[PDB]
Structures are given as C-alpha cells and as structure tokens.
Design a protein around this ligand. Structure first.
Ligand SMILES: NC[C@@H]1O[C@H](O[C@H]2[C@@H](O)[C@H](O[C@@H]3[C@@H](O)[C@H](N)C[C@H](N)[C@H]3O[C@H]3O[C@H](CO)[C@@H](O)[C@H](O)[C@H]3N)O[C@@H]2CO)[C@H](N)[C@@H](O)[C@@H]1O
Ligand SMILES: CC(=O)c1cccc(N[C@H]2[C@H](N)[C@@](NC(=O)N(C)C)([C@H](C)O)[C@@](C)(O)[C@@]2(O)COC(=O)c2c(C)cccc2O)c1
Ligand SMILES: [Mg+2]
Ligand SMILES: [Mg+2]
Ligand SMILES: [Mg+2]
Ligand SMILES: [Mg+2]
Ligand SMILES: [Mg+2]
Ligand SMILES: [Mg+2]
Ligand SMILES: [Mg+2]
Ligand SMILES: [Mg+2]
Ligand SMILES: [Mg+2]
Ligand SMILES: [Mg+2]
Ligand SMILES: [Mg+2]
Ligand SMILES: [Mg+2]
Ligand SMILES: [Mg+2]
Ligand SMILES: [Mg+2]
Ligand SMILES: [Mg+2]
Ligand SMILES: [Mg+2]
Ligand SMILES: [Mg+2]
Ligand SMILES: [Mg+2]
Ligand SMILES: [Mg+2]
Ligand SMILES: [Mg+2]
Ligand SMILES: [Mg+2]
Ligand SMILES: [Mg+2]
Ligand SMILES: [Mg+2]
Ligand SMILES: [Mg+2]
Ligand SMILES: [Mg+2]
Ligand SMILES: [Mg+2]
Ligand SMILES: [Mg+2]
Ligand SMILES: [Mg+2]
Lengths: 125, 150, 99, 208, 138
RNA sequence: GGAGCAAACCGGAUUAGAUACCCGGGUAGUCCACGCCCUAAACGAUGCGCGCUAGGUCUCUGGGUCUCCUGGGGGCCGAAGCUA
RNA sequence: UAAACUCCUGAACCCGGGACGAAACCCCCGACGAGGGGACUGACGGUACCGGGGUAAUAGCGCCGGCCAACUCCGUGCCAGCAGCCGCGGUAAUACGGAGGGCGCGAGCGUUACCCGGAUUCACUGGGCGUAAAGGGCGUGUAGGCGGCCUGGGGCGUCCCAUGUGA
C-alpha cells in the first residue's frame, strides 16, 4: 500500500493461537481420570489406542493419551497431563506423563526411559 | 582441471502407456577456487551419465569472479525468476555464510568470506542460476573507472 | 523557556478566551513521511482583543482555568479565514459519520 | 568433567591422527597406524558422501578433541574470539593455545595435554612464581611457566624435562630446560601451528 | 500532471539507455541541470545541453555505453547499470552526514541535495553536510 | 396492461424411479407508470491520472500540401522489457 | 588401549598454623579546630588461605528413516506401539521393543510450556492483487494526501557548529 495508506492504517500484528489450554500455559496440569477407554485411529492407521478422559484442576475435562508399552490406569486415577497432541486420535491434544501420581512408569523399558518415567534397572548396573 | 562439486541430483518422470519412465538431473559446479566457476545442469537416463554430462556443461559455462582477498567487490541482488539472491562482502574471519547451493558455488570460485541471503523461491536450480548471474555481474573499481571515461 | 506556539484562532464564543488551532509536523517514526497533526489550545485573552481568523502566538502560562494554560502573546497576522474554514468544514463532516 | 574414556579411538574416526596420548599416539600406533578407520561395527565400509553439516561438525570435533576441552568451554571461547578484533579464526586458536594446560604441554613439562591437565590440577605448576591449579587459566604473554620446586624430584617431571634435552619449542615460547621453566613470549599466529584443521569450517559450523 | 520531475528525468534516462539510444530530451529545470552536472562529471553520461523542442526548454542528454560485446547478444555493457530515486513526494528522505550511505562500496554515487548545493556523497561528506537524498546511481 | 413466452402448478411421454431433460396446457412474471430493492462470472476476472520505451498490419472517425503525412478510438502480430 | 596388569600423580579424608574485612566513635597532648598519641571492637569462622600427611577414587541422559551427526541382529506382524512435520508398523521394519555397535552433550541430559528467530508469512528496511488470497459495480465529489517552470523575501521542515541533558 502507499505510504500515506500505511500511515493512515498501518500493518496488523498477527496473534498466535494456543494449541493447548493446560489452561494458563503452565507446563503441566493435574487431573483425575474418568473413563479409561481404547480408541481406534483414523486416516491410514489401525490400532487400539489407550486414552484417558481427564477432569483437570484447570476446570477443563479433556482427553489425553497414555503413552508407553502398557499401563495401570483405572477410573479414579489422578494423573499429570503435559500437552502433545496425538494426531491419529482426533481431540487428543495432551499426553499423560508417566511416573507421576497414579500412572506408574513403564516396566521392562530399557531405552528412552526418562519419557515413560522408569528408573534405572540394576543387573549389569 | 577444476574441482567439481555436485549440488542437486533428482529423478524426474514422464508417463507412458503402462508405466512411468524415469530421467535423472544433476546440478554440478566446477571451479578452481581462484576466480573461475561454472554451473552445469545435465540430464540423462542414469545418474552417473548425468553428473558427467553436467560437469562437461559446467566447463563450457564459466565466469570471471573478481575476488579481492577471498571476497567480492560489492553487494549485488539478483532476481532469477522468483528466486532472489543477495550477496554481501565480508572481512576475513567471517566464513562463507550461505545456504547449501550458493555456498558450493561461492566456495569453488575461491570466495572465503561472504554474507548471503536467499529470498523468494528457494528453488535450488534457480537459486544457482541467480548466484551465477550475481557473480557474472560483479564489477570492480578498475572496470567501473574504465567504463566511465569518454 | 516558556513554550511559545503559534496557530489560528478558531473560536471567540467564550468570554476572555480564544481557541487556537496549532499545527505541528514531523516525520513518522516508522514510515518517515512528514505528517501534520494539530491540537486546540484555550488561551487567555483578558481584553477580548483577538477575533476569529487571527494568527497568534500562544505562550505557556500559569493556570487561568481548568485546561486554560496559555495566554495570547501577540498577533502575528490577521485575516486567515481560509484556515478557519478548513477547521469548520472538518467539524461539520462529523455529523455525516454517524447512524 | 572433561572427556575421560577411550582416546586413540578418535585418533581414529576423525580421520587424522590426533595426539591425545603423546608417547604412543606417536609410535607404531596412535592405534591409527594399525586401523585407519572409524570405530565400531561399520568402520570399514564404503563411507557415504558427507553432508555439509557432517563436514563442519567433524572439523570442530577434531579441533575440540585435540585440546581436550568441553563443548561449553570451547563454545564460550569461540564467542569470545568473535567479539574480539581481528581474524576471528586465528584469535580462537590464540586463545585455545593460551590455556595453561596447553602451554604446559607445549613446553614439554608434560607429554600429553591430558597429562598436562593433571599436572596443573595437582599443583605441580606455577605461573610467575605463584602457583595455579586451573587448566583453563589464560596464560598471557610475559608469563613464566615454572614447575613446582617441590614437584621437581618426580620421575615423570624428570623424564619429560630430560627428553627435552634436544628438543625445540614453538616460536611463541622459550624454555630454560635446567631451571624447568618456560616463557610465553607472545600468542601464536595461525601459521605458527600445524593443526590438521581448517578453522574456516569451524567458524562456519557456529553460523547456524 | 507529472508528480516527480526528477523521477521522470531519471526514468527517461533509465528507458533510453535500455534501448541504446544516443540521446534523450527531458523538460528543463535548473534543479534537473545540477543533477546532470554531477551525472556528467562522474562519467555516467557523455554530457548534456539546453535545447528548444517546439520552442520549449529541454535538456538533451547524451548517453554513454560500453563497447560491443562478444557472443550472442553483443549489446554493450551499460554505464548506468542502476539509477533510482530515494526521496520522493510521497516520502521525503533526509540524512545527516553520518548516515549518508556508501553506494555499492563507492563504485556508485548518491546524488544529494544540500544547503551547499547538489552534491555526491563524497563531495558532501568532505564538505561535512547532508540533506535530501535524491537518488542513487551505479 | 397482458399478444407471445413462461418459474410454480395441471397433464402426456421417457425411466428401474423421473419430483428432470422431451411434448401439451399454464399463473406470478416478462410490458407501462410511480415508488422500493442494490445484487452479479456488475469481467478485461486488470483502480484512476501523468510521463517514458521499436515497429508492422487491419479497422472506425477528424484535419493536411489528401502517393503519403498528422490527431482520436477499436483489433491482430510483435522491439526492448516483464511474467510462475 | 578399552579392560586385566606396570609404574606415576594424589579429589575425598586426617594433622598443624590461621586471616583481610576494623578504624573510627571514645580517651590523652594540642584548642573540644588541624595534627599527633592511646584503648576497645568479628556474626561469617576455626571459614577463606598457607604448610605436613594422604586413598584410583561417580556417570549419566537423549538420539541413530529424511530434515540430522549416528546401522546392524533378533523380537514383532496395520498388533503392540512410534509420531515435531513428512510418515513408520499388513513376516526380512536402519522409523515399533530389545540387544550389540555408533552419534551428541555431560552433573547433567531430555520433556512440556512461553517469547523472539527462521517468517521478505503485516514486507519502513522488505510483499503483493489478469488466471494463485486480493481492484471497491460505476460515478460525483468533502476532509485528507500529493503538485509544472522562473525570481525574490521568511527559515517551519531539512542540514551544520557549539552547549545543557541523557543518574
Ligand atoms: N499488482 C498489480 C497492480 O499494482 C498496481 O500498482 C503497482 C504497480 O503499478 C507498480 O508496481 C511495480 C510493478 O508494476 C512492477 N512489476 C515492478 C515493481 N517491482 C513494482 O513496484 C513496487 O514494488 C517494488 C518492490 O517489489 C517497490 O520497491 C516499488 O516502490 C513498488 N512500486 O506500482 C504499484 C505499486 O504497488 C495497482 N495497485 C493495481 O493495478 C494492481 O494492484
Ligand atoms: C432416442 C431413442 O431412440 C429413444 C428410445 C427409447 C426411449 C427414449 N427416450 C427419450 C425420451 N423421449 C426423452 N426425450 C428425448 O430424447 N427426445 C429427443 C425428446 C425424454 C426427455 O425423457 C429422453 C431424453 O429421455 C430419451 O432420449 C431417452 O434418453 C429415446
Ligand atoms: Mg499405517
Ligand atoms: Mg517476482
Ligand atoms: Mg515461499
Ligand atoms: Mg572399526
Ligand atoms: Mg526515453
Ligand atoms: Mg544533533
Ligand atoms: Mg412432466
Ligand atoms: Mg412446457
Ligand atoms: Mg406454451
Ligand atoms: Mg483488451
Ligand atoms: Mg491506435
Ligand atoms: Mg590409560
Ligand atoms: Mg604415593
Ligand atoms: Mg545422517
Ligand atoms: Mg523413540
Ligand atoms: Mg524383521
Ligand atoms: Mg526415529
Ligand atoms: Mg529401535
Ligand atoms: Mg559445569
Ligand atoms: Mg517479520
Ligand atoms: Mg513495502
Ligand atoms: Mg505474497
Ligand atoms: Mg482470484
Ligand atoms: Mg472495475
Ligand atoms: Mg474525482
Ligand atoms: Mg482536494
Ligand atoms: Mg513545487
Ligand atoms: Mg529552521
């Protein structure tokens, strides 16, 4: 646009939209499981994906993914949520953090252990 | 004989009754690291032959690069189609700061100290052709004087 | 220095006061273009001497009323009813922007 | 803490022979004279054309691994050289070569930078009379780098100072061999060193 | 009505040169003449002169090019590679002497209007002044 | 105001079905005046004004010393140049 | 060369000394001033630091399909799972899980969240609108923006010098 036009109107700064009301941006939010269901993916994937509907302190009831080999979560479970969509599961915008509150960490996990939250094993160590 | 760096190779494909039919392209720079570079683009049914073809084409396509202590006389912007390249002089100790494509070219022309920026279409082929024009278009205090006499 | 400004009397409806429209111009901070802008000052005229159209200077002053902080220093030149027209039209345009 | 782990093993991998053991990484093996290829199961197989990144990465790993310094400390040195006046490549090397741990090794008092490190740490070294146990200490020019009188009797200091019988020391250094004390006359130019490293690639690596 | 005669002049030049014209006329202005003087002194043009076209003041302006060139397209190199207004009616640009730019590391000019007359960057920097940044030519 | 045409609608065909395409009817409407509505593939899908940069060819409309020259307008091919 | 093993040094820990921070207030001489003399005062702390002795004495976390540095064997069979984006998994998976090996950082390494960057993707520097998003359906014209050539006056913009201010 002309200069006179920029002077009259100016440019508009672009507001960035949050992908995540773990409400106030706050890196983690604690909640209570409600339904611990299994959901099928979409698009070109097939599996039985493990999921918690979570009541939060933040007020929101949201659905979260339970990552890892297998889990120990039932209907009143109390867990920490972290954010991280799942992408094959629509409306699943958060993961549960394993190793915190009533989500025990993944047993038998040798490799990327600190996600999944499983302490150092002790046979050759 | 010069050095011969290969920037980009890709496989293209044309359609024919019962199936796709592949060709290969290769972008190759060749240069001595002392004011001569050449850019060559060569296509052929096999990668090998295309790279070779490209180097050949690159030698038939060279350029005066007026270095001045590992860098260039001045700043130049060159638009080639939708790809724009800017080229800026730098003191020594800077390095060649540039993306994969213009860097390979600037390296083999013996530029050692130069600030660049790709603007526009970041298409390798076209970025390379702009870089060549950009070098191609460099003048020095010398030639400019010569141009302005009468 | 008590600030001295200069502009144009565009009202004398009040007793012992004139309204003075004062232009200021300057580069735009980003876009560089020189832009005009203006502001009205209520100025103290204890002798209702100055009238519509006059260019005056205006000087920073000890307060006289709420929002009257300037006195009329001197006449610069009379006439300028053109500039007053400028203001008055700009003003009546306003009624053509409502609903 | 600094690396701690197999050494004439990046003597390998990095292609070039790095001198991280001094006496042996010097004589029918930096392990390198026996196996001139990367460590691990794949070491001897057709290496793939390296990405511009791989290259620049490697060159900086080379330079860093030579001086035995950590990434954080290496990095800050680079950033310091960048602010400073003059060819930012050499300057860095200037600074890297000004580390007491290095000077001590350049001065022959130790056979390895790693071993020089231990000498400096355990109090065996003295700058300008006062003693100093910081490997990172910036030796400036003029500085006399002595050995600790108390430490002189030690087999190790003896051998190394005795094998410096014949030996010649870099142009930026001097060395009274008997008084077991050297000097730091000025900081080295790029040309003064013969490092297997093109720093133009290192500066480049720290550009993105 | 013609909003910027200087931009006009410059552009007449830009255009005539791109087809290797021997000359262009441009309606005459004292200000225009002063810019040409610089232009001529710096060897961008051959020179210029006052003339009448339909009995009205112009400035014929003798353009100047490289030699014939070699391969396909033997069109001469151009002397005025680039010429370009800066300050314009829409947006005046003024500089202090500390912020007069170096045009193409000095292989290029910037013409520049000051209270000590129209000047190139160098002339004006040594003369220690700035002013309206008219145009840059390389 | 209403000849002709014709959404809707009333019928005939066609079709697996045919709330259509085809045929036969047919009201609003299409027409006029006055007052509303204010939309569009309201398209050159191209804001207005001004200067500058080869030509060739066909056309509408002025003027000249009317073979040719010189205005204004509508097309086609194309210098330089621009364009994904 | 990593280990075992051979020499060598000696973090921790034990013994000893042991701070600077504090010279004033005050008192005496001089005059209750200048100057001079004198005495007290340490939470940190038996700490820092110096000296003697002295033990080989912690390593983890992420990653290895491409972007991106690092590849193989097994297990698994559109399952279990991974997933920043592209996408992996349907019996030979460098993409899942484990192993070996490798890369990167290292008392840290990863994760999530938030800001700027890259993004010349609000474009002043520095973008666009025939067909990609984008020319207002067209006019008339208000405010506003912009304004041909010559001379003179003022010096508001603009430029210059000096100076105050910018803790
Ligand atoms: N986008 C096409 C048209 O632009 C028109 O106006 C624009 C064009 O006439 C012209 O823009 C030119 C462009 O023609 C031509 N292709 C070259 C030039 N790059 C452009 O110029 C523009 O962009 C450059 C930066 O790219 C600026 O530096 C320059 O000042 C600006 N005029 O000047 C106007 C600046 O935007 C009309 N708005 C309208 O017809 C349509 O939007
Ligand atoms: C055309 C012909 O042979 C034929 C045969 C059987 C049936 C029909 N039916 C025709 C039927 N009279 C149809 N009309 C038609 O075709 N015309 C040329 C008037 C009508 C609109 O339904 C049609 C378009 O459906 C049709 O063409 C068939 O499609 C046509
Ligand atoms: Mg799948
Ligand atoms: Mg473009
Ligand atoms: Mg793009
Ligand atoms: Mg190996
Ligand atoms: Mg012209
Ligand atoms: Mg100033
Ligand atoms: Mg019918
Ligand atoms: Mg009908
Ligand atoms: Mg009918
Ligand atoms: Mg048209
Ligand atoms: Mg015509
Ligand atoms: Mg060892
Ligand atoms: Mg011992
Ligand atoms: Mg790789
Ligand atoms: Mg993983
Ligand atoms: Mg398998
Ligand atoms: Mg992976
Ligand atoms: Mg795996
Ligand atoms: Mg640390
Ligand atoms: Mg931006
Ligand atoms: Mg812009
Ligand atoms: Mg755009
Ligand atoms: Mg469109
Ligand atoms: Mg239109
Ligand atoms: Mg109008
Ligand atoms: Mg107007
Ligand atoms: Mg004017
Ligand atoms: Mg002034």
């Amino acid at each position: 646009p002309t200069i006179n036009q920029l002077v009259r109107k100016g440019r508009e700064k672009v507001r960035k939209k949050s992908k995540v009301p773990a409400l106030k941006g706050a890196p983690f939010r604690r909640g209570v499981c409600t339904v611990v269901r299994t959901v099928t993916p979409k698009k070109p994937n097939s599996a039985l994906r493990k999921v918690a509907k979570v009541r939060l302190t933040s007020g929101y009831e949201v659905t979260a993914y339970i990552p890892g080999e297998g889990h120990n979560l039932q209907e009143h479970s109390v867990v920490l949520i972290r954010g991280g969509r799942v992408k094959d599961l629509p409306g699943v915008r958060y993961h549960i953090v394993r190793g915190v509150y009533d989500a025990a960490g993944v047993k038998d996990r040798k490799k990327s252990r600190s996600k999944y939250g499983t302490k150092k094993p002790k046979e050759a160590a | 004989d010069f050095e011969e760096k290969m920037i980009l190779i890709r496989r293209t494909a044309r359609m024919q009754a019962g199936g796709r039919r592949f060709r290969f392209g290769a972008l190759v720079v060749v240069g001595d690291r002392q004011g001569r570079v050449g850019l060559g683009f060569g296509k052929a049914p096999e990668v090998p032959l295309a790279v070779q073809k490209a180097g050949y084409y690159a030698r038939r396509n060279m350029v005066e690069v007026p270095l001045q202590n590992g860098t260039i006389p001045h700043e130049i912007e060159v638009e080639f189609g939708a790809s724009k390249i800017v080229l800026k002089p730098a003191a020594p100790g800077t390095g060649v700061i540039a993306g994969a494509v213009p860097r390979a070219i600037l390296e083999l022309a013996g530029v050692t100290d130069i600030l660049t920026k790709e603007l526009g279409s970041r298409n390798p082929i076209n970025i390379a052709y702009a870089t060549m024009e950009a070098l191609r278009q460099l003048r020095t205090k010398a030639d400019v004087e010569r141009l302005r006499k009468g | 220095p008590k600030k001295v400004l200069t502009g144009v009397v565009v009202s004398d409806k009040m007793q012992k006061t004139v309204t003075v429209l004062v232009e200021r111009q300057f580069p735009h901070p980003l876009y560089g273009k020189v832009i005009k802008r203006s502001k009205k000052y209520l100025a103290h005229d204890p002798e209702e001497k100055y009238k519509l159209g006059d260019v005056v200077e205006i000087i920073e002053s000890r307060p006289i009323s709420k929002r009257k902080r300037f006195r009329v220093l001197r006449l610069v030149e009379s006439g300028r009813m053109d500039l007053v027209e400028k203001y008055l039209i700009r003003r009546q345009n306003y009624e053509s922007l409502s609903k | 803490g600094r690396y701690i782990g197999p050494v004439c093993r990046l003597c390998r991998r990095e292609g070039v022979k790095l001198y991280l053991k001094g006496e042996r990484c010097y004589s029918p093996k930096c392990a390198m004279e026996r196996r001139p290829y990367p460590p691990g199961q794949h070491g001897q197989k057709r290496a793939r054309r390296p990405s511009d990144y791989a290259v620049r990465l490697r060159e900086k790993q080379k330079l860093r691994r030579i001086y035995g310094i950590s990434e954080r400390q290496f990095r800050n040195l680079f950033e310091e050289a960048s602010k400073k006046k003059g060819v930012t490549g050499s300057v860095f090397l200037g600074l890297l070569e000004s580390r007491l741990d290095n000077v001590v090794y350049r001065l022959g008092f130790a056979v390895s930078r790693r071993q020089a490190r231990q000498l400096v740490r355990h109090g065996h070294i003295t700058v300008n009379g006062r003693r100093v146990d910081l490997p990172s200490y910036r030796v400036r020019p003029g500085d006399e780098i002595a050995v600790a009188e108390k430490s002189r009797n030690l087999e190790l200091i003896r051998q190394n100072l005795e094998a410096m019988k014949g030996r010649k020391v870099g142009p930026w250094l001097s060395l009274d061999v008997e008084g077991m004390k050297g000097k730091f006359l000025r900081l080295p130019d790029r040309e003064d060193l013969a490092l297997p490293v093109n720093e133009q690639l290192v500066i480049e690596f720290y550009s993105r | 009505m013609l909003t910027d005669p200087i931009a006009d002049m410059l552009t007449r030049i830009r255009n005539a040169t791109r087809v290797y014209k021997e000359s262009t006329d441009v309606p005459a202005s004292r200000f225009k003449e002063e810019i040409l003087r610089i232009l001529a002194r710096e060897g961008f043009i051959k020179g210029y002169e006052r003339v009448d076209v339909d009995g009205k003041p112009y400035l014929r302006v003798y353009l100047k090019y490289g030699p014939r060139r070699q391969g396909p397209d033997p069109r001469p190199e151009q002397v005025i590679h680039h010429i370009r207004r800066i300050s314009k009616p829409g947006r005046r640009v003024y500089v202090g002497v500390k912020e007069i730019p170096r045009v193409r590391r000095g292989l290029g000019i910037a013409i520049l209007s000051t209270s000590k007359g129209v000047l190139t960057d160098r002339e004006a920097r040594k003369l220690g002044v700035g002013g309206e940044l008219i145009c840059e030519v390389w």
